[PDB]
Amino acid sequence: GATESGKRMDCPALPPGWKKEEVIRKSGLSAGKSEVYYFSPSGKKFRSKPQLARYLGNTVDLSSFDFRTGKMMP
């Protein structure tokens, strides 16, 4: 399900066609650490909430969006 790692999955809190992936680091000091990426319907990768906001503009209100889980968490 939603906490499964290494697998792109639907993010239903965003507009249609957005997906999310959790990727675990392998090499280097920061190994094991978990990061989250988003993919637009066009397939571009997004690495931060501010980056999503810049791209989505007023088509979404991300004010309560939790980047790590992809849920709206008021």
Add this chain to the structure above:
DNA sequence: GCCAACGTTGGC
């Protein structure tokens, strides 16, 4: 001390 957010780099 942490980590959100971003900059840099190696490998292609």
Add this chain to the structure above:
DNA sequence: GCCAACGTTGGC
């Protein structure tokens, strides 16, 4: 030149 992957750090 691209981009996955790691390193870096200002703001908290």
